[PDB]
Amino acid sequence: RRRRNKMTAYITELSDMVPTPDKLTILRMAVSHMKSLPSFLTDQELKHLILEAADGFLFIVSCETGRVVYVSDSVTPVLNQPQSEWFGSTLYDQVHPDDVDKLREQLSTSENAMGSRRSFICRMRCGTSSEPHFVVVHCTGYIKAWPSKFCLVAIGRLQVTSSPNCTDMSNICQPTEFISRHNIEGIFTFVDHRCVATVGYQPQELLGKNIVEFCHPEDQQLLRDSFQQVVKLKGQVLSVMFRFRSKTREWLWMRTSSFTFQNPYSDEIEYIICTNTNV
Amino acid sequence: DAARSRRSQETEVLYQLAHTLPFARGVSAHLDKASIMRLTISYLRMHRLCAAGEWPLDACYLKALEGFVMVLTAEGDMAYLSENVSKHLGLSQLELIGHSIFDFIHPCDQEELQDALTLEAPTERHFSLRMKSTLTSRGRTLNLKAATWKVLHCSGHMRAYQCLVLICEAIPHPAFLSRHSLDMKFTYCDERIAEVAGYSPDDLIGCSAYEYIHALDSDAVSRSIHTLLSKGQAVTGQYRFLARTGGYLWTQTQATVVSSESIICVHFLISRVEETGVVLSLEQTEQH
Numbered sequence: 342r343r344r345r346n347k348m349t350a351y352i353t354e355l356s357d358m359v360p361t362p363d364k365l366t367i368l369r370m371a372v373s374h375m376k377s378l379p380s381f382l383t384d385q386e387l388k389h390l391i392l393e394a395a396d397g398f399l400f401i402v403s404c405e406t407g408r409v410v411y412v413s414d415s416v417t418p419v420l421n422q423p424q425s426e427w428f429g430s431t432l433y434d435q436v437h438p439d440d441v442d443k444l445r446e447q448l449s450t451s452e453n454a455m456g457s458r459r460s461f462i463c464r465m466r467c468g469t470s471s472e473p474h475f476v477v478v479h480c481t482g483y484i485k486a487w488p489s490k491f492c493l494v495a496i497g498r499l500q501v502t503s504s505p506n507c508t509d510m511s512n513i514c515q516p517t518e519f520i521s522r523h524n525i526e527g528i529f530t531f532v533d534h535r536c537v538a539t540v541g542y543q544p545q546e547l548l549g550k551n552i553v554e555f556c557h558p559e560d561q562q563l564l565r566d567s568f569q570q571v572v573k574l575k576g577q578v579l580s581v582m583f584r585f586r587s588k589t590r591e592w593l594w595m596r597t598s599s600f601t602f603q604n605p606y607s608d609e610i611e612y613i614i615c616t617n618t619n620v
Numbered sequence: 621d622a623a624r625s626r627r628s629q630e631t632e633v634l635y636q637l638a639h640t641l642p643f644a645r646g647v648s649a650h651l652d653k654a655s656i657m658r659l660t661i662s663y664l665r666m667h668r669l670c671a672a673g674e675w676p677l678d679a680c681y682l683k684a685l686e687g688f689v690m691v692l693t694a695e696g697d698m699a700y701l702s703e704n705v706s707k708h709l710g711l712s713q714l715e716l717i718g719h720s721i722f723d724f725i726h727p728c729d730q731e732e733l734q735d736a737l738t739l740e741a742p743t744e745r746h747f748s749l750r751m752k753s754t755l756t757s758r759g760r761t762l763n764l765k766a767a768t769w770k771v772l773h774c775s776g777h778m779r780a781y782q783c784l785v786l787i788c789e790a791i792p793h794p795a796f797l798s799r800h801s802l803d804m805k806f807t808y809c810d811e812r813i814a815e816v817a818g819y820s821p822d823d824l825i826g827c828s829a830y831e832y833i834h835a836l837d838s839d840a841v842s843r844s845i846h847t848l849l850s851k852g853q854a855v856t857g858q859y860r861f862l863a864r865t866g867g868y869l870w871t872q873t874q875a876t877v878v879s880s881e882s883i884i885c886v887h888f889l890i891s892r893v894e895e896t897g898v899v900l901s902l903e904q905t906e907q908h
Protein backbone atom coordinates (compact mmCIF):
# COMPACT_ATOMS: atom_id res chain seq x y z
CA ARG A 342 0.00 0.00 0.00
CA ARG A 343 3.00 2.20 -0.53
CA ARG A 344 1.58 1.77 -4.04
CA ARG A 345 -1.57 3.81 -3.36
CA ASN A 346 -0.35 6.24 -0.76
CA LYS A 347 1.52 7.44 -3.84
CA MET A 348 -1.65 7.05 -5.93
CA THR A 349 -3.69 9.08 -3.43
CA ALA A 350 -0.90 11.67 -3.43
CA TYR A 351 -0.94 11.51 -7.25
CA ILE A 352 -4.68 12.13 -7.40
CA THR A 353 -4.51 15.00 -4.91
CA GLU A 354 -1.68 16.51 -6.99
CA LEU A 355 -3.79 16.15 -10.14
CA SER A 356 -6.73 17.81 -8.39
CA ASP A 357 -4.54 20.76 -7.44
CA MET A 358 -3.23 21.01 -11.01
CA VAL A 359 -6.58 21.03 -12.87
CA PRO A 360 -8.46 24.39 -12.93
CA THR A 361 -11.68 23.07 -11.39
CA PRO A 362 -14.72 15.68 -5.56
CA ASP A 363 -13.77 12.01 -5.12
CA LYS A 364 -10.84 10.20 -6.87
CA LEU A 365 -12.92 9.02 -9.89
CA THR A 366 -14.52 12.43 -10.41
CA ILE A 367 -11.24 14.35 -10.24
CA LEU A 368 -9.67 11.85 -12.66
CA ARG A 369 -12.78 12.08 -14.92
CA MET A 370 -12.38 15.86 -15.02
CA ALA A 371 -8.63 15.37 -15.63
CA VAL A 372 -9.60 13.47 -18.79
CA SER A 373 -11.82 16.35 -19.90
CA HIS A 374 -9.19 18.98 -19.15
CA MET A 375 -6.62 16.87 -20.99
CA LYS A 376 -8.84 17.07 -24.04
CA SER A 377 -9.00 20.83 -23.40
CA LEU A 378 -5.40 21.14 -24.64
CA PRO A 379 2.41 14.21 -30.97
CA SER A 380 5.17 15.25 -28.56
CA PHE A 381 5.33 16.31 -24.92
CA LEU A 382 6.01 19.94 -25.83
CA THR A 383 5.63 21.74 -29.13
CA ASP A 384 8.62 22.68 -31.28
CA GLN A 385 7.93 26.34 -30.44
CA GLU A 386 7.94 25.66 -26.69
CA LEU A 387 11.15 23.64 -26.98
CA LYS A 388 12.80 26.39 -29.04
CA HIS A 389 12.01 28.93 -26.32
CA LEU A 390 13.21 26.52 -23.62
CA ILE A 391 16.52 25.98 -25.43
CA LEU A 392 16.95 29.74 -25.81
CA GLU A 393 16.17 30.16 -22.11
CA ALA A 394 18.99 27.71 -21.32
CA ALA A 395 21.52 28.67 -24.03
CA ASP A 396 22.93 32.09 -24.89
CA GLY A 397 22.81 31.11 -28.53
CA PHE A 398 21.27 31.70 -31.93
CA LEU A 399 20.32 29.55 -34.92
CA PHE A 400 21.89 30.05 -38.34
CA ILE A 401 21.69 28.17 -41.64
CA VAL A 402 24.56 28.77 -44.06
CA SER A 403 25.40 27.35 -47.47
CA CYS A 404 28.09 24.70 -47.23
CA GLU A 405 29.87 25.69 -50.48
CA THR A 406 30.18 29.46 -50.04
CA GLY A 407 29.19 30.04 -46.41
CA ARG A 408 26.33 32.27 -47.58
CA VAL A 409 23.94 33.04 -44.72
CA VAL A 410 20.65 31.43 -45.73
CA TYR A 411 18.95 32.22 -42.42
CA VAL A 412 19.73 33.74 -39.03
CA SER A 413 17.43 34.10 -36.04
CA ASP A 414 16.80 37.34 -34.15
CA SER A 415 18.65 35.83 -31.16
CA VAL A 416 21.87 36.88 -32.90
CA THR A 417 21.46 40.48 -31.78
CA PRO A 418 21.03 39.87 -28.01
CA VAL A 419 23.87 37.33 -28.33
CA LEU A 420 26.39 38.92 -30.71
CA ASN A 421 25.28 42.59 -30.45
CA GLN A 422 24.81 42.47 -34.23
CA PRO A 423 21.60 43.31 -36.12
CA GLN A 424 20.26 40.87 -38.68
CA SER A 425 21.27 43.58 -41.18
CA GLU A 426 24.89 42.44 -40.94
CA TRP A 427 24.23 38.70 -41.30
CA PHE A 428 21.57 38.59 -44.02
CA GLY A 429 23.13 39.12 -47.43
CA SER A 430 26.59 38.07 -46.20
CA THR A 431 28.53 34.84 -45.67
CA LEU A 432 29.63 33.16 -42.46
CA TYR A 433 33.21 34.04 -43.45
CA ASP A 434 32.26 37.73 -43.25
CA GLN A 435 31.48 37.14 -39.56
CA VAL A 436 34.37 34.98 -38.34
CA HIS A 437 37.97 35.77 -37.44
CA PRO A 438 40.24 35.56 -40.52
CA ASP A 439 42.30 32.85 -38.80
CA ASP A 440 39.18 30.65 -38.46
CA VAL A 441 38.36 30.66 -42.18
CA ASP A 442 40.22 27.45 -43.05
CA LYS A 443 38.71 25.60 -40.08
CA LEU A 444 35.21 26.79 -41.01
CA ARG A 445 35.73 25.76 -44.65
CA GLU A 446 36.73 22.27 -43.52
CA GLN A 447 33.65 22.14 -41.29
CA LEU A 448 31.49 23.14 -44.27
CA SER A 449 32.90 20.53 -46.66
CA THR A 450 30.62 17.56 -47.37
CA SER A 451 33.32 15.36 -49.04
CA GLU A 452 33.34 12.70 -46.26
CA ASN A 453 30.22 13.45 -44.18
CA ALA A 454 27.17 14.71 -46.07
CA MET A 455 23.41 14.60 -45.40
CA GLY A 456 22.45 14.16 -41.76
CA SER A 457 26.03 14.21 -40.49
CA ARG A 458 26.97 16.34 -37.49
CA ARG A 459 29.32 19.28 -36.98
CA SER A 460 30.99 20.49 -33.78
CA PHE A 461 33.49 23.35 -33.76
CA ILE A 462 34.58 26.54 -32.02
CA CYS A 463 35.25 29.80 -33.83
CA ARG A 464 35.36 33.55 -33.21
CA MET A 465 32.61 35.83 -34.50
CA ARG A 466 32.35 39.60 -34.88
CA CYS A 467 30.32 41.42 -32.25
CA GLY A 468 28.85 44.90 -32.52
CA THR A 469 31.73 47.36 -32.20
CA SER A 470 31.58 51.08 -31.47
CA SER A 471 34.85 51.85 -33.28
CA GLU A 472 37.85 47.82 -35.72
CA PRO A 473 36.20 44.48 -35.00
CA HIS A 474 35.91 42.73 -31.66
CA PHE A 475 35.68 38.94 -31.65
CA VAL A 476 33.94 36.57 -29.25
CA VAL A 477 34.27 32.81 -28.89
CA VAL A 478 31.22 30.92 -30.20
CA HIS A 479 30.66 27.18 -29.85
CA CYS A 480 28.83 25.88 -32.94
CA THR A 481 26.94 22.60 -33.21
CA GLY A 482 24.77 21.55 -36.11
CA TYR A 483 23.98 19.18 -38.94
CA ILE A 484 24.21 19.08 -42.73
CA LYS A 485 20.89 19.30 -44.57
CA ALA A 486 19.86 19.51 -48.22
CA TRP A 487 18.30 22.88 -48.97
CA PRO A 488 15.26 22.85 -51.33
CA SER A 489 24.56 23.78 -54.57
CA LYS A 490 21.98 22.65 -52.02
CA PHE A 491 23.90 21.35 -48.98
CA CYS A 492 23.73 23.64 -45.95
CA LEU A 493 24.79 23.69 -42.31
CA VAL A 494 21.94 24.17 -39.83
CA ALA A 495 23.67 25.09 -36.59
CA ILE A 496 23.33 26.85 -33.26
CA GLY A 497 26.09 29.11 -31.96
CA ARG A 498 26.34 29.67 -28.22
CA LEU A 499 28.39 31.83 -25.88
CA GLN A 500 29.27 31.01 -22.26
CA VAL A 501 29.26 27.24 -22.77
CA THR A 502 31.87 27.02 -19.98
CA SER A 503 33.24 29.43 -17.40
CA SER A 504 35.08 32.42 -18.80
CA PRO A 505 38.86 32.51 -18.29
CA ASN A 506 40.92 35.14 -16.53
CA CYS A 507 41.89 36.82 -19.80
CA THR A 508 43.79 39.71 -18.18
CA ASP A 509 43.81 39.58 -14.30
CA MET A 510 43.38 43.44 -14.58
CA SER A 511 41.49 45.06 -11.64
CA ASN A 512 42.08 48.71 -12.80
CA ILE A 513 42.18 50.70 -16.04
CA CYS A 514 45.68 52.19 -15.55
CA GLN A 515 49.24 50.86 -15.36
CA PRO A 516 49.24 47.34 -13.79
CA THR A 517 49.68 46.99 -10.04
CA GLU A 518 50.77 43.34 -9.85
CA PHE A 519 52.02 40.37 -11.84
CA ILE A 520 51.79 36.60 -11.50
CA SER A 521 54.89 34.42 -11.21
CA ARG A 522 55.67 30.74 -10.77
CA HIS A 523 58.69 29.38 -8.93
CA ASN A 524 60.30 26.01 -8.36
CA ILE A 525 60.99 24.68 -4.87
CA GLU A 526 64.30 26.59 -4.80
CA GLY A 527 62.60 29.92 -5.53
CA ILE A 528 63.73 30.27 -9.16
CA PHE A 529 61.50 32.28 -11.51
CA THR A 530 60.05 29.75 -13.96
CA PHE A 531 57.06 31.84 -15.10
CA VAL A 532 56.19 35.54 -15.14
CA ASP A 533 53.67 37.59 -17.10
CA HIS A 534 54.60 40.77 -18.96
CA ARG A 535 53.09 43.11 -16.34
CA CYS A 536 56.41 42.76 -14.51
CA VAL A 537 57.81 45.33 -16.96
CA ALA A 538 55.35 47.89 -15.60
CA THR A 539 55.61 46.94 -11.92
CA VAL A 540 59.35 46.34 -11.38
CA GLY A 541 60.83 47.48 -14.71
CA TYR A 542 62.38 44.12 -15.62
CA GLN A 543 61.70 42.20 -18.79
CA PRO A 544 60.44 38.65 -18.15
CA GLN A 545 63.79 37.19 -19.27
CA GLU A 546 65.55 39.43 -16.73
CA LEU A 547 63.60 37.61 -13.98
CA LEU A 548 63.36 34.03 -15.27
CA GLY A 549 66.25 31.84 -14.17
CA LYS A 550 67.05 34.04 -11.16
CA ASN A 551 65.87 33.53 -7.59
CA ILE A 552 63.25 35.79 -6.05
CA VAL A 553 65.55 36.39 -3.07
CA GLU A 554 68.06 38.02 -5.44
CA PHE A 555 65.48 40.82 -5.78
CA CYS A 556 64.64 41.12 -2.07
CA HIS A 557 66.24 43.58 0.34
CA PRO A 558 68.79 41.80 2.58
CA GLU A 559 67.14 43.14 5.74
CA ASP A 560 63.93 41.43 4.54
CA GLN A 561 65.42 38.26 3.07
CA GLN A 562 65.08 36.02 6.15
CA LEU A 563 61.39 37.03 6.33
CA LEU A 564 60.87 36.22 2.64
CA ARG A 565 62.62 32.82 3.06
CA ASP A 566 60.62 31.99 6.21
CA SER A 567 57.32 32.68 4.41
CA PHE A 568 58.33 30.55 1.43
CA GLN A 569 59.26 27.67 3.72
CA GLN A 570 55.79 28.15 5.19
CA VAL A 571 53.84 27.74 1.96
CA VAL A 572 55.63 24.58 0.83
CA LYS A 573 54.58 23.20 4.23
CA LEU A 574 51.07 24.68 3.98
CA LYS A 575 50.30 22.61 0.84
CA GLY A 576 47.81 24.80 -1.06
CA GLN A 577 47.04 27.49 1.51
CA VAL A 578 47.91 31.10 0.66
CA LEU A 579 50.41 33.09 2.73
CA SER A 580 51.33 36.73 2.18
CA VAL A 581 54.63 38.51 2.85
CA MET A 582 55.70 42.12 2.36
CA PHE A 583 59.30 42.96 1.50
CA ARG A 584 61.44 45.49 -0.37
CA PHE A 585 61.76 44.35 -3.98
CA ARG A 586 64.77 45.67 -5.91
CA SER A 587 63.32 47.56 -8.87
CA LYS A 588 65.32 48.62 -11.93
CA THR A 589 64.71 52.40 -11.66
CA ARG A 590 62.71 53.27 -8.49
CA GLU A 591 65.09 51.68 -5.94
CA TRP A 592 63.34 49.62 -3.23
CA LEU A 593 59.62 49.05 -3.82
CA TRP A 594 57.38 47.72 -1.08
CA MET A 595 55.88 44.52 -2.49
CA ARG A 596 53.26 42.09 -1.21
CA THR A 597 53.74 38.55 -2.51
CA SER A 598 50.88 36.13 -1.87
CA SER A 599 52.00 32.56 -2.50
CA PHE A 600 50.62 29.03 -2.46
CA THR A 601 51.93 25.70 -3.70
CA PHE A 602 50.27 24.04 -6.69
CA GLN A 603 49.47 20.47 -5.66
CA ASN A 604 49.37 17.83 -8.37
CA PRO A 605 45.68 16.76 -8.28
CA TYR A 606 46.75 13.09 -8.48
CA SER A 607 50.22 12.60 -6.97
CA ASP A 608 49.90 15.53 -4.50
CA GLU A 609 53.45 16.54 -5.46
CA ILE A 610 54.42 20.21 -5.60
CA GLU A 611 54.33 21.30 -9.24
CA TYR A 612 55.42 24.87 -8.41
CA ILE A 613 54.66 27.83 -6.15
CA ILE A 614 52.33 30.49 -7.57
CA CYS A 615 52.82 34.08 -6.41
CA THR A 616 50.87 37.30 -6.95
CA ASN A 617 53.45 40.09 -6.62
CA THR A 618 51.68 43.40 -5.95
CA ASN A 619 53.20 46.82 -5.37
CA VAL A 620 51.89 47.87 -1.96
CA ASP B 621 -19.53 -5.51 -4.54
CA ALA B 622 -20.33 -2.12 -6.04
CA ALA B 623 -16.91 -1.07 -4.69
CA ARG B 624 -15.02 -2.97 -7.38
CA SER B 625 -17.55 -1.80 -9.98
CA ARG B 626 -16.60 1.77 -9.11
CA ARG B 627 -12.95 0.63 -9.09
CA SER B 628 -13.22 -0.62 -12.67
CA GLN B 629 -14.90 2.70 -13.49
CA GLU B 630 -11.91 4.54 -11.97
CA THR B 631 -9.22 2.74 -13.88
CA GLU B 632 -11.23 2.70 -17.11
CA VAL B 633 -11.20 6.48 -16.85
CA LEU B 634 -7.49 6.47 -15.93
CA TYR B 635 -6.79 4.46 -19.10
CA GLN B 636 -8.88 7.12 -20.84
CA LEU B 637 -6.52 9.68 -19.27
CA ALA B 638 -3.61 7.60 -20.61
CA HIS B 639 -5.02 7.87 -24.12
CA THR B 640 -5.17 11.64 -23.52
CA LEU B 641 -1.37 11.83 -23.16
CA PRO B 642 0.85 13.40 -25.89
CA PHE B 643 2.47 10.13 -26.95
CA ALA B 644 2.12 7.84 -29.96
CA ARG B 645 -0.72 5.39 -30.70
CA GLY B 646 0.02 2.26 -28.63
CA VAL B 647 2.51 3.78 -26.18
CA SER B 648 -0.41 3.88 -23.72
CA ALA B 649 -0.33 0.09 -23.35
CA HIS B 650 3.24 -0.08 -21.99
CA LEU B 651 2.38 2.15 -19.01
CA ASP B 652 1.21 1.47 -15.47
CA LYS B 653 -1.32 3.55 -13.54
CA ALA B 654 1.43 5.23 -11.48
CA SER B 655 3.43 6.31 -14.53
CA ILE B 656 0.24 7.38 -16.34
CA MET B 657 -0.57 9.63 -13.38
CA ARG B 658 2.99 10.98 -13.11
CA LEU B 659 3.21 11.82 -16.81
CA THR B 660 -0.14 13.62 -16.64
CA ILE B 661 1.01 15.63 -13.58
CA SER B 662 4.18 16.68 -15.36
CA TYR B 663 2.43 17.47 -18.66
CA LEU B 664 0.12 19.84 -16.79
CA ARG B 665 3.01 21.44 -14.89
CA MET B 666 5.07 21.95 -18.05
CA HIS B 667 2.01 23.42 -19.77
CA ARG B 668 1.56 25.80 -16.84
CA LEU B 669 5.23 26.78 -17.13
CA CYS B 670 5.15 27.27 -20.91
CA ALA B 671 1.99 29.36 -20.52
CA ALA B 672 4.09 31.82 -18.48
CA GLY B 673 6.37 32.43 -21.47
CA GLU B 674 5.56 35.70 -23.25
CA TRP B 675 5.43 34.62 -26.89
CA PRO B 676 8.49 25.99 -39.16
CA LEU B 677 12.20 26.24 -38.31
CA ASP B 678 11.39 25.56 -34.64
CA ALA B 679 12.32 21.87 -34.87
CA CYS B 680 15.88 22.67 -35.99
CA TYR B 681 16.82 23.91 -32.51
CA LEU B 682 16.69 20.56 -30.70
CA LYS B 683 18.17 19.04 -33.85
CA ALA B 684 21.05 21.54 -33.74
CA LEU B 685 21.99 20.73 -30.14
CA GLU B 686 24.13 17.74 -29.23
CA GLY B 687 22.95 17.14 -25.66
CA PHE B 688 19.46 17.19 -24.20
CA VAL B 689 17.42 19.87 -22.44
CA MET B 690 16.55 19.39 -18.77
CA VAL B 691 14.32 21.52 -16.54
CA LEU B 692 14.87 20.96 -12.80
CA THR B 693 12.65 22.44 -10.10
CA ALA B 694 13.92 24.07 -6.92
CA GLU B 695 13.34 20.77 -5.08
CA GLY B 696 15.43 18.85 -7.62
CA ASP B 697 12.45 17.49 -9.55
CA MET B 698 13.07 16.60 -13.18
CA ALA B 699 10.30 18.80 -14.55
CA TYR B 700 11.23 18.22 -18.18
CA LEU B 701 13.56 16.22 -20.42
CA SER B 702 13.64 16.20 -24.21
CA GLU B 703 13.25 13.06 -26.29
CA ASN B 704 16.90 12.85 -27.37
CA VAL B 705 17.82 12.10 -23.75
CA SER B 706 17.17 8.48 -24.74
CA LYS B 707 20.13 8.82 -27.11
CA HIS B 708 22.40 9.87 -24.22
CA LEU B 709 21.20 7.84 -21.22
CA GLY B 710 19.00 5.12 -22.75
CA LEU B 711 16.28 6.04 -20.27
CA SER B 712 13.54 7.75 -22.26
CA GLN B 713 11.55 10.78 -21.17
CA LEU B 714 8.65 8.38 -20.57
CA GLU B 715 10.49 6.97 -17.54
CA LEU B 716 12.20 10.13 -16.25
CA ILE B 717 9.81 13.10 -16.34
CA GLY B 718 8.41 13.58 -12.84
CA HIS B 719 11.02 11.61 -10.91
CA SER B 720 13.67 13.31 -8.78
CA ILE B 721 17.12 14.00 -10.21
CA PHE B 722 18.74 12.77 -6.99
CA ASP B 723 17.40 9.27 -7.74
CA PHE B 724 19.45 9.21 -10.97
CA ILE B 725 22.73 11.00 -10.18
CA HIS B 726 25.88 9.84 -8.43
CA PRO B 727 25.69 10.32 -4.63
CA CYS B 728 28.89 12.40 -4.50
CA ASP B 729 27.50 14.87 -7.08
CA GLN B 730 24.30 15.74 -5.19
CA GLU B 731 26.05 18.44 -3.13
CA GLU B 732 27.30 20.11 -6.32
CA LEU B 733 23.84 19.90 -7.83
CA GLN B 734 22.19 21.49 -4.75
CA ASP B 735 24.81 24.24 -4.67
CA ALA B 736 23.88 24.84 -8.32
CA LEU B 737 20.17 24.88 -7.40
CA THR B 738 20.59 27.73 -4.89
CA LEU B 739 33.94 35.19 -13.90
CA GLU B 740 30.38 33.90 -14.02
CA ALA B 741 27.28 35.99 -14.17
CA PRO B 742 25.06 35.67 -11.06
CA THR B 743 22.53 33.28 -12.66
CA GLU B 744 24.55 31.27 -15.20
CA ARG B 745 25.35 27.70 -14.17
CA HIS B 746 28.16 25.38 -15.29
CA PHE B 747 28.60 21.99 -13.64
CA SER B 748 29.54 18.37 -14.33
CA LEU B 749 27.09 15.63 -13.36
CA ARG B 750 27.09 11.83 -13.31
CA MET B 751 23.72 10.44 -14.38
CA LYS B 752 22.47 6.88 -14.64
CA SER B 753 22.59 5.53 -18.18
CA THR B 754 21.60 2.11 -19.52
CA LEU B 755 23.51 2.53 -22.80
CA THR B 756 26.47 0.60 -24.17
CA SER B 757 28.12 0.28 -27.59
CA ARG B 758 25.22 -2.04 -28.55
CA GLY B 759 22.33 0.18 -27.43
CA ARG B 760 20.15 0.02 -24.34
CA THR B 761 21.54 -3.29 -23.09
CA LEU B 762 21.71 -2.57 -19.34
CA ASN B 763 18.82 -3.01 -16.97
CA LEU B 764 18.48 -0.05 -14.63
CA LYS B 765 20.25 -1.62 -11.65
CA ALA B 766 23.44 -2.30 -13.63
CA ALA B 767 23.29 1.18 -15.17
CA THR B 768 26.60 3.00 -15.50
CA TRP B 769 27.55 6.57 -14.66
CA LYS B 770 27.68 8.94 -17.64
CA VAL B 771 29.39 12.30 -17.23
CA LEU B 772 27.36 15.23 -18.55
CA HIS B 773 28.59 18.80 -18.90
CA CYS B 774 25.50 20.85 -18.02
CA SER B 775 25.26 24.58 -18.63
CA GLY B 776 22.20 26.74 -18.26
CA HIS B 777 20.29 29.43 -16.44
CA MET B 778 18.25 29.80 -13.26
CA ARG B 779 14.91 31.25 -14.48
CA ALA B 780 12.21 32.06 -11.91
CA TYR B 781 8.72 32.61 -13.40
CA GLN B 782 11.27 28.97 -10.41
CA CYS B 783 13.60 26.72 -12.49
CA LEU B 784 17.10 25.69 -13.63
CA VAL B 785 17.06 24.92 -17.35
CA LEU B 786 20.19 23.20 -18.67
CA ILE B 787 21.70 21.91 -21.85
CA CYS B 788 23.42 18.68 -20.78
CA GLU B 789 25.98 17.29 -23.23
CA ALA B 790 28.06 14.13 -23.26
CA ILE B 791 31.85 14.12 -23.52
CA PRO B 792 32.81 11.85 -26.45
CA HIS B 793 35.01 8.86 -25.66
CA PRO B 794 38.13 8.93 -27.92
CA ALA B 795 41.69 14.37 -34.07
CA PHE B 796 44.50 16.12 -32.18
CA LEU B 797 45.17 13.87 -29.20
CA SER B 798 47.52 13.87 -26.24
CA ARG B 799 48.07 10.99 -23.83
CA HIS B 800 49.20 11.42 -20.23
CA SER B 801 49.63 9.45 -17.05
CA LEU B 802 47.42 10.33 -14.09
CA ASP B 803 49.99 12.96 -13.04
CA MET B 804 49.36 14.56 -16.48
CA LYS B 805 52.91 13.92 -17.70
CA PHE B 806 53.00 13.65 -21.49
CA THR B 807 53.20 10.08 -22.75
CA TYR B 808 52.15 11.04 -26.29
CA CYS B 809 51.10 14.11 -28.25
CA ASP B 810 49.87 14.65 -31.81
CA GLU B 811 52.58 15.43 -34.35
CA ARG B 812 50.62 18.56 -35.31
CA ILE B 813 51.93 20.33 -32.14
CA ALA B 814 54.96 21.52 -34.24
CA GLU B 815 52.85 23.60 -36.60
CA VAL B 816 50.53 24.65 -33.81
CA ALA B 817 52.87 25.45 -30.90
CA GLY B 818 56.44 24.66 -32.05
CA TYR B 819 57.18 21.56 -29.93
CA SER B 820 58.51 18.30 -31.18
CA PRO B 821 56.35 15.47 -29.77
CA ASP B 822 59.48 13.76 -28.42
CA ASP B 823 60.46 16.91 -26.51
CA LEU B 824 57.17 16.85 -24.57
CA ILE B 825 57.33 13.21 -23.41
CA GLY B 826 58.01 13.05 -19.69
CA CYS B 827 57.25 16.74 -19.19
CA SER B 828 54.46 17.85 -16.87
CA ALA B 829 51.52 19.43 -18.68
CA TYR B 830 50.98 21.95 -15.87
CA GLU B 831 54.24 23.67 -16.88
CA TYR B 832 52.70 24.49 -20.28
CA ILE B 833 49.57 26.35 -19.13
CA HIS B 834 49.39 30.06 -18.38
CA ALA B 835 49.40 30.71 -14.64
CA LEU B 836 46.22 32.80 -14.96
CA ASP B 837 44.43 29.58 -15.97
CA SER B 838 46.04 27.13 -13.52
CA ASP B 839 43.22 27.21 -10.96
CA ALA B 840 40.65 26.51 -13.67
CA VAL B 841 42.70 23.69 -15.21
CA SER B 842 43.31 22.35 -11.70
CA ARG B 843 39.58 22.09 -10.99
CA SER B 844 38.99 20.38 -14.33
CA ILE B 845 41.67 17.79 -13.63
CA HIS B 846 40.07 17.08 -10.25
CA THR B 847 36.77 16.41 -12.02
CA LEU B 848 38.64 14.30 -14.57
CA LEU B 849 40.14 12.28 -11.73
CA SER B 850 36.91 11.88 -9.73
CA LYS B 851 34.26 11.38 -12.43
CA GLY B 852 36.25 9.81 -15.30
CA GLN B 853 35.73 12.60 -17.84
CA ALA B 854 36.02 16.38 -17.90
CA VAL B 855 36.01 19.40 -20.18
CA THR B 856 37.93 22.60 -19.50
CA GLY B 857 37.21 26.20 -20.28
CA GLN B 858 39.34 28.22 -22.65
CA TYR B 859 42.94 28.28 -21.45
CA ARG B 860 46.33 29.39 -22.74
CA PHE B 861 48.95 26.84 -23.78
CA LEU B 862 52.51 28.13 -24.02
CA ALA B 863 54.27 27.89 -27.38
CA ARG B 864 57.90 26.79 -27.65
CA THR B 865 59.77 30.00 -28.50
CA GLY B 866 57.31 32.29 -26.71
CA GLY B 867 53.72 33.38 -26.51
CA TYR B 868 50.65 31.21 -26.10
CA LEU B 869 47.60 29.90 -27.93
CA TRP B 870 43.99 29.68 -26.80
CA THR B 871 42.66 26.13 -26.62
CA GLN B 872 40.01 23.93 -25.04
CA THR B 873 40.33 20.32 -23.96
CA GLN B 874 38.14 17.28 -23.36
CA ALA B 875 39.67 14.57 -21.18
CA THR B 876 38.83 10.93 -20.47
CA VAL B 877 40.34 8.40 -18.06
CA VAL B 878 40.89 5.09 -19.84
CA SER B 879 41.73 1.49 -18.87
CA SER B 880 46.99 0.83 -15.44
CA GLU B 881 44.87 3.93 -16.11
CA SER B 882 45.77 6.72 -18.53
CA ILE B 883 44.32 10.07 -19.61
CA ILE B 884 43.41 10.93 -23.21
CA CYS B 885 42.91 14.60 -24.10
CA VAL B 886 41.28 15.95 -27.26
CA HIS B 887 42.39 19.54 -27.89
CA PHE B 888 40.58 22.18 -29.94
CA LEU B 889 42.58 25.23 -31.01
CA ILE B 890 40.68 28.48 -30.50
CA SER B 891 43.32 30.97 -31.66
CA ARG B 892 46.82 30.97 -33.09
CA VAL B 893 50.00 31.86 -31.19
CA GLU B 894 49.59 35.29 -29.61
CA GLU B 895 52.46 37.51 -28.40
CA THR B 896 55.18 35.37 -29.96
CA GLY B 897 57.86 37.95 -29.14
CA VAL B 898 57.03 37.69 -25.44
CA VAL B 899 58.76 34.98 -23.42
CA LEU B 900 56.81 33.88 -20.35
CA SER B 901 58.48 30.73 -18.96
CA LEU B 902 62.05 29.55 -18.38
CA GLU B 903 61.74 26.88 -21.08
CA GLN B 904 60.63 29.41 -23.71
CA THR B 905 63.72 31.48 -22.81
CA GLU B 906 66.16 28.62 -23.35
CA GLN B 907 64.65 27.55 -26.63
CA HIS B 908 64.51 31.19 -27.81
Ligand SMILES: CCCCCCCC/C=C\CCCCCCCC(=O)NCCO
Binds near residue numbers: 812813829841844874
Ligand atom coordinates in the same frame (compact mmCIF):
# COMPACT_ATOMS: atom_id res chain seq x y z
C1 LIG C 1 41.76 18.72 -17.71
C2 LIG C 1 42.72 18.34 -18.81
C3 LIG C 1 43.12 19.57 -19.58
C4 LIG C 1 44.57 19.49 -19.88
C5 LIG C 1 45.32 20.65 -19.31
C6 LIG C 1 46.67 20.69 -19.94
C7 LIG C 1 46.64 20.20 -21.32
C8 LIG C 1 47.96 20.43 -21.92
C9 LIG C 1 48.23 19.23 -22.74
C10 LIG C 1 48.25 19.36 -24.01
C11 LIG C 1 48.00 20.69 -24.63
C12 LIG C 1 48.09 20.48 -26.13
C13 LIG C 1 47.25 21.43 -26.95
C14 LIG C 1 47.14 20.89 -28.35
C15 LIG C 1 46.94 21.98 -29.36
C16 LIG C 1 46.42 21.38 -30.65
C17 LIG C 1 45.20 22.11 -31.16
C18 LIG C 1 44.68 21.70 -32.51
O1 LIG C 1 45.14 22.17 -33.49
N1 LIG C 1 43.60 20.74 -32.51
C19 LIG C 1 42.95 20.31 -33.67
C20 LIG C 1 42.23 21.46 -34.32
O2 LIG C 1 41.44 22.10 -33.42
